[PDB]
Amino acid sequence: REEAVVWDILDEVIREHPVLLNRAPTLHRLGIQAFEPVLIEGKAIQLHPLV
Amino acid sequence: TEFLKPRLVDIEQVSSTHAKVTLEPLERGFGHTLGNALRRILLSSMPGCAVTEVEIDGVLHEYSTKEGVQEDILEILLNLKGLAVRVQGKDEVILTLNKSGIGPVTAADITHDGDVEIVKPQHVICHLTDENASISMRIKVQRGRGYVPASTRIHSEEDERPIGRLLVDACYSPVERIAYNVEAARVEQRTDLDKLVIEMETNGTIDPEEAIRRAATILAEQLEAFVD
Amino acid sequence: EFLKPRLVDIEQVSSTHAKVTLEPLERGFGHTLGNALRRILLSSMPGCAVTEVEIDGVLHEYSTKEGVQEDILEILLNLKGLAVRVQGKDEVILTLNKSGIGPVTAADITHDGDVEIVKPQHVICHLTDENASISMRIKVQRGRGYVPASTRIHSEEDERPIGRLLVDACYSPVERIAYNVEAARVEQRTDLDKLVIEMETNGTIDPEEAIRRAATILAEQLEAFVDLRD
Amino acid sequence: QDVVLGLYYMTRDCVNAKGEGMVLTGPKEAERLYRSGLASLHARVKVRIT
Amino acid sequence: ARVTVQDAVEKIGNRFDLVLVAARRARQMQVGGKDPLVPEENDKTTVIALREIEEGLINNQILDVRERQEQQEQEA
Amino acid sequence: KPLVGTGMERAVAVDSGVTAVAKRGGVVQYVDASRIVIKVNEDEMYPGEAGIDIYNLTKYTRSNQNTCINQMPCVSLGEPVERGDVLADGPSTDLGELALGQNMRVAFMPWNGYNFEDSILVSERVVQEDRFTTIHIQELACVSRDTKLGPEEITADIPNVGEAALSKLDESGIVYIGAEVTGGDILVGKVTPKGETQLTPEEKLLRAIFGEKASDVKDSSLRVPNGVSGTVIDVQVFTRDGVEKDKRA
Amino acid sequence: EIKELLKLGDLPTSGQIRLYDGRTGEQFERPVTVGYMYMLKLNHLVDDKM
Ligand SMILES: Nc1nc2c(ncn2[C@@H]2O[C@H](COP(=O)(O)OP(=O)(O)O)[C@@H](OP(=O)(O)OP(=O)(O)O)[C@H]2O)c(=O)[nH]1
């Protein structure tokens, strides 16, 4: 059903847990990096431009 | 129909002159409408008091040097530009500096008058050397709104006044710096809402909270004609 | 030491197009009010729009009626634009019933007291058969901003009737807004400016009421903002 | 790429603009001057910096 | 300290057994045999263990010495 | 339509078979969103029984990629048309011309790094008007085979499902045409024979206590894929020869 | 020929016009190229890729 309570629990679990982002041609060790996730609307992943 | 009014407006004043203000949650898009309205009115149209003109008894042009003052006339002009004066009743007053001897001529050395208050008695103005150390000047303080550069007065100064009358940029608005950041903030289910971070540094005379408050007051008062 | 802007002549060039002027504006607030008003006008002006449509012989948007040329989907798209002014109630159910060959325009809608059809000439559909007859019920609500079909499902409330056809609600009558700050040299004064707000709408909100409503909303937000309870 | 363009534009100098030869008491005042439209974002100037 | 672990590496120069020490501490916290030595900021036990390592309050020596201390206490 | 074309777009549109083109030009007698009926000119009329030409159009059928392929009539009652005129516009076609996409007002400038790289920023105004909204017609298939444990059935009786989910099925167990569904919803009710549960002891205890008679039938109904929501536009039923068709069939 | 046709429309012959920043209301320096381009929505839809 996914009511507000589920979103609060998800927010609390996600807080300090980091996730790994990878791009199919991992040329060097920086092809895999870990980031702290921020929940957002939409179906697209937003990554910081500089990296 | 029915709008959303913001709650939880916390203000952490690090360094009494520096105040950060957080404001949420606001309907979509109003972050920038209020940030900009506030900034523009606050910065450009704010009643204040400031030094406008200066007279040195000794020199005819602002690029010459006076004997025994290490700082050039430019430096003393800039030191006077920053000087924060708050007058209660009178609109324009003429302050005099007469100092002698070795050491730093500071704002404290101004003649202590009734209606004029110097918020920083220890603000450095000039450094005077030894054994000659003669400094005399007349600084004019006037009240006005906003920022007026010297170049427009010198342009429109058809009333020619005698030599030595060195114009300085009049910084009336007591707000030295202001900016607003808009950031994503969601009210438990609506994500299309925003947070306003207002960082403001003023120059002592007015406390930041009062600056914000009177700015918004005057804007609303202008708006007064239409609000039903 | 300030002045204040008073609403002076408010000319209407066309039924949709109107220019509203504010004469005694102090230097520097021309742009501030121009922009603030523009923003509020475009974003928050409450308007009316069709929310849902029920046609009898049609289960879903994709089928087709005998004797009409537009598809059901095109009839929905045409109804989305229907500009209507409702005074008292929030939810009106208009009934359109026409037969025979001819273009069924909005004027054929059964005229209720409280509803004003701004442009009765607006076309809806084209019949092509002597005996072809369409009947429908259009449910029109009041609302502000933009709500799509898919979000409104939250309030489903037993949508059981398969005949109900949801339409995206563009609940906003203001189409376009521009402002011009021009020096309004009054014979006794130094630095005053005039605001000329040119606004184009679908012909639902009258200009004066629009400007007033915007000023109201901005004033309320500034009310909350001036007081600071740390 | 975009960043570098922005910074290049911001820092680049121009022969003549608004506020040629003004003396500003600090960077915050510089920013106040630019945001008020009393000076172009790039124009040669004498500034006090610590 | 969920930005840069530089101070923990300045405390422990290996930069690898750091993660093992932090894991031992944070698992000692998860299975509630112990309690946090730092006021929590709604953080999880990972960054809590990092914060405990970086301030010099906890390292390998304090874990082993205090562990055998509590063990010998629990012997009775 | 393209504002800036090359002239070839009419050749491309006509030459494809998606447009409907007049074979003997004449006058359009009857126009409907399903057929265009045209009376041929006396000139081109074959001597023995020429009569009129009727063009049946194709309405939303599923394309190989699941996109919509529907033709809309262009001309109106009483329009005179010539041999080789464009009667009905195919998908992505306007008045005979190729209209692959749509033309928008673009401004070349950096807007706070939201178009940093080749990414594109877009205004709510385009979505408001629904000008880039696509229709996709997906196909789903529920097949009832006969296992050696017993033939499966399509009945609506689905063990331990809430009747809220059943509400949208007829007595035959097939969604009503035009019902709006969402991911997870049941489209075709189907049950499969399965026995020898071999429940674990504790389950035996629970069955004893509460009286939970275990139903020997597994659930199989064809539910909608995750995150898809639309209207059931059409249904087809194929029964093998021999079996007794059901009410809906 | 484009210049001519643009003149027939009563539009700036250089094809750039000054734009005002919709958030703040300030004008942009250096007018920017605006105009209509024909764009396409490709079959690579995020709805499927996620
Ligand atoms: N990249 C970047 N980081 C910023 C910026 N401003 C603040 N930070 C860092 O982000 C963290 C802020 O987190 P908090 O203020 O504690 O609030 P939180 O609950 O969301 O984590 C701080 O690091 P921290 O995890 O708290 O480190 P530490 O001080 O605990 O060791 C801070 O140093 C910034 O402008 N850019």
mmCIF file of C-alpha atoms in Angstrom, chain A residues 1-41:
data_model
loop_
_atom_site.group_PDB
_atom_site.id
_atom_site.type_symbol
_atom_site.label_atom_id
_atom_site.label_comp_id
_atom_site.label_asym_id
_atom_site.label_seq_id
_atom_site.Cartn_x
_atom_site.Cartn_y
_atom_site.Cartn_z
ATOM 1 C CA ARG A 1 0.000 0.000 0.000
ATOM 2 C CA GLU A 2 2.953 2.294 0.820
ATOM 3 C CA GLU A 3 1.569 4.993 3.116
ATOM 4 C CA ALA A 4 3.512 7.777 4.814
ATOM 5 C CA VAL A 5 4.804 5.436 7.517
ATOM 6 C CA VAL A 6 6.676 3.372 4.932
ATOM 7 C CA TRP A 7 8.295 6.508 3.539
ATOM 8 C CA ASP A 8 9.425 7.579 7.008
ATOM 9 C CA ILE A 9 10.992 4.184 7.731
ATOM 10 C CA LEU A 10 12.698 4.241 4.338
ATOM 11 C CA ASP A 11 14.031 7.734 5.017
ATOM 12 C CA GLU A 12 15.411 6.606 8.374
ATOM 13 C CA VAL A 13 17.140 3.514 6.960
ATOM 14 C CA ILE A 14 18.599 5.405 3.993
ATOM 15 C CA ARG A 15 20.111 8.108 6.211
ATOM 16 C CA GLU A 16 23.681 6.870 6.743
ATOM 17 C CA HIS A 17 23.675 3.875 4.416
ATOM 18 C CA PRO A 18 25.875 4.454 1.319
ATOM 19 C CA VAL A 19 25.263 2.959 -2.136
ATOM 20 C CA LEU A 20 27.742 2.245 -4.920
ATOM 21 C CA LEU A 21 27.423 3.712 -8.413
ATOM 22 C CA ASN A 22 29.161 2.106 -11.378
ATOM 23 C CA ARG A 23 29.272 2.741 -15.130
ATOM 24 C CA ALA A 24 29.605 -0.257 -17.462
ATOM 25 C CA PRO A 25 33.189 0.550 -18.667
ATOM 26 C CA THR A 26 35.035 0.667 -15.342
ATOM 27 C CA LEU A 27 38.398 1.718 -16.778
ATOM 28 C CA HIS A 28 40.161 2.488 -13.474
ATOM 29 C CA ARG A 29 39.332 2.206 -9.794
ATOM 30 C CA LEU A 30 37.288 5.418 -9.901
ATOM 31 C CA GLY A 31 34.740 3.737 -12.162
ATOM 32 C CA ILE A 32 33.026 2.543 -8.974
ATOM 33 C CA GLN A 33 32.368 5.130 -6.291
ATOM 34 C CA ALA A 34 30.149 5.233 -3.229
ATOM 35 C CA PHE A 35 27.683 8.040 -2.584
ATOM 36 C CA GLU A 36 25.155 8.967 0.059
ATOM 37 C CA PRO A 37 21.690 8.720 -1.516
ATOM 38 C CA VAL A 38 19.092 11.476 -1.409
ATOM 39 C CA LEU A 39 15.551 10.356 -2.149
ATOM 40 C CA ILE A 40 14.019 12.193 -5.103
ATOM 41 C CA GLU A 41 10.940 11.999 -7.287
#
